Design a binder for this molecule. Structure first.
Ligand SMILES: *[C@H](C)[C@H]1/C(=C/c2[nH]c(/C=C3N=C(/C=C4\NC(=O)C(CC)=C4C)C(C)=C\3CCC(=O)O)c(CCC(=O)O)c2C)NC(=O)[C@@H]1C
Ligand SMILES: *[C@H](C)[C@H]1/C(=C/c2[nH]c(/C=C3N=C(/C=C4\NC(=O)C(CC)=C4C)C(C)=C\3CCC(=O)O)c(CCC(=O)O)c2C)NC(=O)[C@@H]1C
Ligand SMILES: *[C@H](C)[C@H]1/C(=C/c2[nH]c(/C=C3N=C(/C=C4\NC(=O)C(CC)=C4C)C(C)=C\3CCC(=O)O)c(CCC(=O)O)c2C)NC(=O)[C@@H]1C
Ligand SMILES: *[C@H](C)[C@H]1/C(=C/c2[nH]c(/C=C3N=C(/C=C4\NC(=O)C(CC)=C4C)C(C)=C\3CCC(=O)O)c(CCC(=O)O)c2C)NC(=O)[C@@H]1C
Ligand SMILES: *[C@H](C)[C@H]1/C(=C/c2[nH]c(/C=C3N=C(/C=C4\NC(=O)C(CC)=C4C)C(C)=C\3CCC(=O)O)c(CCC(=O)O)c2C)NC(=O)[C@@H]1C
Ligand SMILES: *[C@H](C)[C@H]1/C(=C/c2[nH]c(/C=C3N=C(/C=C4\NC(=O)C(CC)=C4C)C(C)=C\3CCC(=O)O)c(CCC(=O)O)c2C)NC(=O)[C@@H]1C
Ligand SMILES: *[C@H](C)[C@H]1/C(=C/c2[nH]c(/C=C3N=C(/C=C4\NC(=O)C(CC)=C4C)C(C)=C\3CCC(=O)O)c(CCC(=O)O)c2C)NC(=O)[C@@H]1C
Ligand SMILES: *[C@H](C)[C@H]1/C(=C/c2[nH]c(/C=C3N=C(/C=C4\NC(=O)C(CC)=C4C)C(C)=C\3CCC(=O)O)c(CCC(=O)O)c2C)NC(=O)[C@@H]1C
Ligand SMILES: *[C@H](C)[C@H]1/C(=C/c2[nH]c(/C=C3N=C(/C=C4\NC(=O)C(CC)=C4C)C(C)=C\3CCC(=O)O)c(CCC(=O)O)c2C)NC(=O)[C@@H]1C
Ligand SMILES: CCC1=C(C)/C(=C/C2=NC(=C\c3[nH]c(/C=C4\NC(=O)[C@H](C)[C@H]4CC)c(C)c3CCC(=O)O)/C(CCC(=O)O)=C2C)NC1=O
Lengths: 161, 160, 68, 48, 160, 48, 161, 160, 161, 161, 161, 161
């Protein structure tokens, strides 16, 4: 997988061009903002469980999904969905730190859509939980990294749907 | 420490230290004086920080110091303050080491099992660590306050 | 108790192994539910992709009969 | 220095193969006795 | 890159980045402003350093341009100079990257296997990379030389 | 042909072995099963 | 897999018949060419690396495959391609000595086209390299076993294409 | 057979065919004429050998031709003779094949489950095979009869 | 494995005390001697192979170890050297980067005497080889950084013998 | 493991000598007896179960060993004893083929006496069974290879006892 | 301890059985070789120190064992190694006289390996010395008792290894 | 036991070298500090009982240790504990004089942990007493030998804990 720097490096290596003004501009644009990415990642790591809590509270729980009959019935399915929620949050944080969605395209979306189809998982409910996580994360991190996290959250949600 | 995490990382591949690792080791040795000064400043004010943090914790969560509380009684409160002092010591160790490697092995692995066996409120201990963080950040300049507080949030997140 | 029937390819890109690496670069094998997550994570970590997943063994209702 | 020991052993490293050891080790790895076609290998090897 | 290396360990151990890991991730970017012009100067010499390195290595080892030599002939010399240019480009990609990633992942993991059927002398390539490392620092200041020498040391430390 | 590198983890060192050292050994009998073909299938099959 | 003798023996076993005149003629036709196969296999085994070098130089080197954007670009992919070249040469020797492409179907061609499609490898380039190996092997072995060697390389090329 | 085992072992070893491994191939191609002659000499008397082994087996085991035996009745006696002809065909297959692999893959794997489901004496079948070996050894020459008895005794040990 | 930083913390933790003046003096001394270590590590690297060759020529070769009967008589016994070495470098370059014996006792020098006793491998010869590399690295590294490299090499040799 | 040829070649290599007349005469003696060992090994492989058959019937069964309280009592112990007896027969065959007891010492004799002491297996009874198969093998193989077969069984019996 | 006669007597007493034909045959087999053992034991007893001297010259001394860093270096360790060698020779003589390695099991091999592991002694070198005494004694005694002497030295070497 | 001079001599003798510049500099490094060590040892010997009294007063007595249920209760146990304190002080003095903790490893810490665990002695209390003695000794001796004295007390404490 790739981040901003590695993406620039191999995207130039494919046609064998040295780093030019546009390439150094892209690298500078990445380096000028990643410190806010570091702060947002630290805040997200410190508040991971609360984010999954509020996303589940405002998007999944108190519903027929958690009622008998939904996908979120039984503590086993509850723990599985919350573990999936945690995995989505952590990979979103990795994507935000890296500044490239290749990490999501490889270690997140690969073998997930058809797996959810075969397991009967509600894709709409999963997308709603992802947007709940994005809302909570944007509330926590602040204006500095809100859009930076939101773009990759939207990437994951659009990949799922 | 960062030296441990860097040298052993370049030993699992059977190579010398990478040129990418003949860096941040360098940043660590450069910032070693600042880290030592911050650790000494925290160590000098260990009793004030512990006392004020315990005060704030007992106001925020008065149920623990109630009759049905884990820390009810003068010596049960003494043990709670001793635990807070232990975590302050671990935070200073982490600050000097430059990594949370020592505090992780010393006071985080198995803490859930220990506190569940003792029947202690882990969220209450986390709030106590947060109060210690606030009191410590009140005694430091902004950069050093952020540097110590980041380890404090590590402890708060790990006890969770 | 249910085994997912999947197919996948996994390329090794750091060691260039030099013997019978054709049976290890594309496979279909029944994998249990309890081990399917850890097995599927390995393909993504190595860098390959899973081509298909099929539940095969059981029903999507779950509830009783899940344990094994 | 050195606070514990697991002891030493008597190791016999291999210097070279020379067909006989290779055939015997290949037979031993399957634990099956010499094959019918494996028999003639020793025959012409001793004939050479 | 440094971020790629850190995220690799974090995902392998199934955890977030560490408290000593973000300290290194932030220190990798703060010197990026200085380091950007460092590789830029090496970038704007790319068709000159290798051209002057050809006469420095082929004069040292005169059997590379002889009847019994691998680089005998104009077009055979051209391949060796193009290899020098490739490795110079890769080392610049790594110096604008951080860790060994751009060189090791692309044109370092299996040079022995490439030359296994290609017949190009590794001990000669050692002196070639030594010469490249020696002829590329002088364009830089010693302050930049300190930020350049390890980045060139890895090639002749790996192929060895 | 290079040194066979045995990669290790963060607790133990990683090792290297000369190729010629293992080239004079008993040459490592191994057992492998060829049966992914299709499972449901199409190729040459047979029981092998 | 099966050789000539094993193939005829199995074909007679499926019908439950003792070995007849036609099977005896087939066995004699295999036996009369036993020595030449051994000599050809010895020659190819002794000259194996040189065949790969000549085939690579005549088929895949000095082209866009080795340049950036090519499949064989980077030392990992170059070593992988030459290792596949050695695989094809060794298994072609196996098929030529056994007198049957059954092993070629069983252990080489099975899933090879689909895995090359998944990885993006040039099938036409691999076919050209295999034909270069066939030419070199036919040159070295001589008239005695040239077409016996070349039929199995043609089998590999036709299975790939 | 011999070729299959040699190639399988070499490929498991991950190397070319050994110089010693090709020696078995050369020996096989040398002895193919003699083994084919012995094979035809066995096949020219399939019913006669089955006959004489029939007298030997019936005289040695009145158990099998007893009321409690499985040969009581001309139909099942004919079935037993057909089985003996089957095993003679299998052993001549193995003789031509040079390795016992066809014999193993036709008639000794699951033969125990065979004759247990059929309720038939495995020692009686082994005695019949041994009588067949004696008749065949009388019908051939001693040197080739050594290898033929090797195959026959491998079969006898397999059904036991 | 421990460095100075970890060693002081581990020693001050079992007795449950905060870092006092003595601990801050030890850590301060290591931090002040933290640049020559890094420079000499890079110097030992790059020139590693020539160091090994010179040490081998100075101590190992030109003795009974190369004549018939020696434990470096043929190649592959010679090849187990350069290897065997490259450790004793590699390690102790780690030691004079995270300066403490620790690593040298836990990874390299621990049961090595037992392994050598079970495999032959003259311990006196492999200690003379260590001292040869000590001399060559003292020559290459510099005047002041010749020491502590001499310290770790002497520790390795003394522990082995 | 080692055999006659490998033992001789290593014995002259360790000195650093050319293979002289005495060594060629020992290889003379080994090579002139080769086919007898091969036919003996073929006979043993063909009659392995029956050799154990008569050996058990003459040395072990119909005694106190098989009755309750005996070591070989119960189906598990009977199967284990016969598997051991077959192990001894097969490794004696390997030693006879190789012309050396190094394989027997390396992979059978070490740990055997200690394991039997640990489990309570009667070593005298095991030696009796080995002598039983020695007599049976001498009967089967005949004058040509009787002594050559019996020497390794005697070696195994002496090593155990 | 036990000799052949005492071993047979104990094997029959444990069954509570009078001596039968098999026991009489075993005792007769020991009796017919009594004199050769006595003659060989007298030979070794007369030439005890010469056997140790030649064994040390052939296998131990003039090596790295007697040089600095060796386990045989210094007068104390040299005396210890020769006294161990003498112990092995004397108990080998006792075992050869008694026709049973039970004395070697009881008084020498029991714990010797773990003592050597604790002391750091090279077990490989000890095995080499034991074999060297083996060939020296085999040369001295002659064909009559060569194998009978050699079996117990081999037993000691296998017990140590 | 071994000291600085004997340690240098032994670590040169086991490698069979003569006294070189490094060992010479080590030995003058010991020689230069001879007077300070002997003066500190004389001071400690003159103030032996007072140091133990003050350390016991600061760390052990006037607590639950000397009350019933404490390990230091009863005259026998009190005398044994102060005897142990005298043990630690005297061996620390010997180690300080010799400049080597080898005497501490050989004659103090070997099996002490298991002995204390068997007897029920509080190891943490023992380490606290050792540290109190170290503080008092550092007070008495002065900066001249305070560090050298403290390193061996710290070695004892680290070994015990
Ligand atoms: C009551 C004695 C204790 C207690 C409970 C409590 N539970 C919730 C919320 C939920 N409980 C469940 C439970 C289940 N789901 C299942 O599949 C099963 C197995 C049959 C169970 C038992 C679920 C799913 C929820 C979430 C809401 C929902 O059902 O949709 C709460 C509310 C917590 C909140 O934050 O709102 C509470 C309080 N609380 C106590 O103090 C008792 C110890
Ligand atoms: C949670 C918000 C929703 C939900 C989910 C749910 N998931 C499963 C089972 C699995 N989920 C995964 C997921 C992943 N594999 C990956 O590689 C990644 C990214 C790295 C993900 C996210 C997998 C592999 C499984 C199967 C294996 C396993 O669970 O160990 C279940 C269980 C289904 C069942 O009962 O059979 C559920 C319920 N459920 C909801 O209600 C939410 C909408
Ligand atoms: C070489 C002439 C061409 C080429 C090839 C190429 N191949 C790979 C990767 C693989 N090749 C194999 C091959 C086999 N597996 C088997 O079982 C057998 C027969 C026994 C063969 C021949 C496989 C399985 C792989 C994938 C795993 C691996 O990489 O080892 C690569 C690398 C692709 C990548 O980077 O992922 C390449 C480049 N490339 C060319 O340009 C030539 C046309
Ligand atoms: C120059 C200092 C030495 C030298 C070199 C030499 N190289 C070639 C040919 C090739 N070199 C490469 C190299 C690479 N491909 C990659 O992907 C990478 C990683 C970035 C490298 C380094 C390749 C692919 C070739 C083949 C041609 C091609 O690129 O298409 C030659 C020519 C060999 C020939 O047979 O013609 C030579 C001579 N020779 C010396 O003497 C120097 C020590
Ligand atoms: C070289 C100067 C001397 C010498 C050495 C020699 N060593 C071996 C074999 C081995 N050496 C090692 C060593 C290590 N493994 C480790 O993990 C470490 C520390 C990290 C060390 C030092 C081991 C384990 C082996 C055996 C396996 C292997 O080869 O990797 C040999 C080969 C012996 C043989 O032929 O069997 C030799 C020759 N020989 C000399 O003459 C020098 C004194
Ligand atoms: C009787 C219904 C069938 C039968 C039996 C038969 N058995 C033997 C000989 C032995 N049987 C055993 C059995 C066991 N050993 C155990 O540990 C157990 C588990 C409790 C059993 C069942 C043994 C050990 C022997 C060997 C002699 C001995 O005990 O010392 C024979 C004799 C075989 C021979 O002499 O060759 C026979 C005949 N025969 C039938 O026809 C019945 C179907
Ligand atoms: C049979 C004639 C005698 C006898 C034997 C007996 N052996 C066992 C158990 C084991 N025997 C072995 C033997 C080997 N493993 C090897 O790898 C080799 C050399 C290649 C040998 C010789 C082992 C390892 C075991 C233990 C594990 C296992 O059972 O497989 C038993 C079983 C003991 C028990 O019940 O625990 C027996 C009975 N017993 C006699 O009475 C005969 C004299
Ligand atoms: C000599 C050929 C080899 C060798 C030997 C060696 N041994 C020792 C020390 C001891 N050896 C023994 C031996 C025995 N104790 C017994 O009960 C028996 C059975 C009769 C034996 C053989 C013991 C007990 C010791 C320890 C003596 C002590 O306490 O000092 C040494 C000395 C080791 C030392 O550190 O001093 C040596 C050298 N060394 C070689 O190199 C030869 C291969
Ligand atoms: C009183 C008549 C005399 C006297 C006594 C005195 N004692 C102490 C201090 C201690 N005495 C003990 C005694 C014991 N511990 C035991 O286990 C037993 C056996 C049952 C006894 C008797 C101890 C342990 C102490 C130490 C303090 C403690 O108990 O924790 C003092 C104090 C001395 C000091 O320096 O503080 C005194 C004065 N003094 C006299 O003059 C009387 C003759
Ligand atoms: C049996 C296979 C085999 C060989 C041959 C072998 C050789 C061998 N040659 C060596 C050295 C050496 N060999 C030579 C020279 C030469 N070498 C030659 O084959 C030429 C005839 C000649 C040059 C014309 C020299 C000069 C050295 C010293 C090392 C050096 O060159 O710096 C060494 C290093 C140890 C030593 O100095 O003795 C080995 C192991 N080992 C093996 O296992």
């Amino acid at each position: 997988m790739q981040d901003a720097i590695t993406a620039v490096i191999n995207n130039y290596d494919v046609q064998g061009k040295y780093l030019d003004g546009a390439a150094l501009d892209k690298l500078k644009a990445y380096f000028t903002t990643g410190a806010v990415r570091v702060r947002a990642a630290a805040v997200i790591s410190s508040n991971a469980t609360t984010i999954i809590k509020e996303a589940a509270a405002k998007a999944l729980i108190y519903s027929d999904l958690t009622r008998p009959g939904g996908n979120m019935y039984t503590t086993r399915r509850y723990a599985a969905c919350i573990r999936d929620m945690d995995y989505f949050l952590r990979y979103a944080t990795y994507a935000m730190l890296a500044g490239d969605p290749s990490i999501l395209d490889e270690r997140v979306l690969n073998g997930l859509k058809e797996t959810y189809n075969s397991l009967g998982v509600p894709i709409a409910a999963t997308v709603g939980g992802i947007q709940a996580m994005k809302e909570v994360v944007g509330g926590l991190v602040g204006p500095d990294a809100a859009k930076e996290a939101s773009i990759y959250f939207d990437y994951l949600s659009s990949g799922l749907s | 420490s960062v030296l441990t995490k860097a040298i052993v990382n370049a030993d699992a591949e059977a190579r010398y230290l990478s040129p990418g690792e003949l860096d941040r080791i360098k940043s660590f040795v450069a910032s070693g004086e600042r880290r030592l000064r911050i650790a000494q400043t925290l160590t000098e004010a260990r009793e004030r920080i512990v006392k004020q943090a315990g005060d704030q914790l007992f106001q925020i969560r008065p149920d623990v110091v109630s009759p049905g509380g884990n820390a009810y009684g003068e010596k049960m409160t003494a043990l709670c303050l001793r635990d807070l002092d232990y975590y302050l010591r671990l935070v200073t160790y982490g600050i000097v080491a430059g990594d949370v490697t020592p505090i992780e092995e010393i006071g985080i692995i198995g803490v859930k099992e220990m506190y569940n066996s003792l029947q202690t409120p882990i969220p209450a201990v986390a709030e106590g660590v947060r109060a210690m963080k606030n009191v410590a950040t009140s005694l430091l300049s902004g950069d050093d306050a952020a540097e110590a507080g980041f380890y404090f949030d590590y402890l708060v997140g790990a006890m969770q | 108790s249910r085994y997912f029937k999947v197919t996948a390819c996994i390329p090794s890109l750091k060691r260039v192994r030099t013997g019978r690496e054709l049976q290890n670069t594309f496979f279909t094998k029944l994998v249990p539910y309890e081990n399917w997550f850890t097995e599927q994570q390995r393909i993504q970590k190595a860098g390959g992709k899973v081509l298909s997943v099929k539940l095969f063994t059981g029903v999507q209702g779950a509830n009783t009969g899940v344990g094994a | 220095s050195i606070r514990g020991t697991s002891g030493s052993t008597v190791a016999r490293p291999r210097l070279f193969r020379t067909v006989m050891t290779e055939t015997i080790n290949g037979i031993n790895a399957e634990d099956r006795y010499p094959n019918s076609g494996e028999v003639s290998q020793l025959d012409q090897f001793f004939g050479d | 890159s440094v971020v790629l290396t850190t995220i690799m360990n974090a995902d392998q151990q199934l955890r977030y980045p560490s408290v000593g890991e973000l300290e290194q991730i932030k220190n990798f970017m703060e010197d990026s402003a200085l380091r950007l012009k460092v590789a830029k100067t090496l970038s704007d010499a790319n068709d000159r350093v290798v051209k002057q390195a050809s006469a420095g290595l082929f004069q040292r080892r005169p059997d590379l341009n002889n009847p019994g030599g691998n680089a005998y002939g104009e077009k055979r010399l051209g391949s060796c100079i193009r290899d020098l240019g490739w490795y110079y480009r890769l080392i610049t990609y790594s110096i604008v990257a951080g860790n060994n990633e751009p060189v090791e992942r692309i044109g370092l993991t299996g040079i022995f296997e490439m030359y296994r059927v290609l017949e190009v002398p590794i001990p000669a390539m050692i002196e070639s990379m030594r010469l490249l490392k020696k002829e590329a620092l002088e364009l830089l200041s010693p302050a930049e030389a300190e930020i350049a020498a390890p980045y060139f040391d890895y090639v002749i430390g790996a192929m060895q | 042909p290079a040194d066979i590198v045995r990669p290790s983890s963060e607790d133990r060192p990683g090792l290297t072995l000369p190729y010629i050292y293992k080239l004079s050994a008993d040459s490592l009998t191994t057992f492998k099963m060829t049966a992914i073909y299709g499972a449901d299938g199409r190729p040459k099959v047979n029981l092998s």
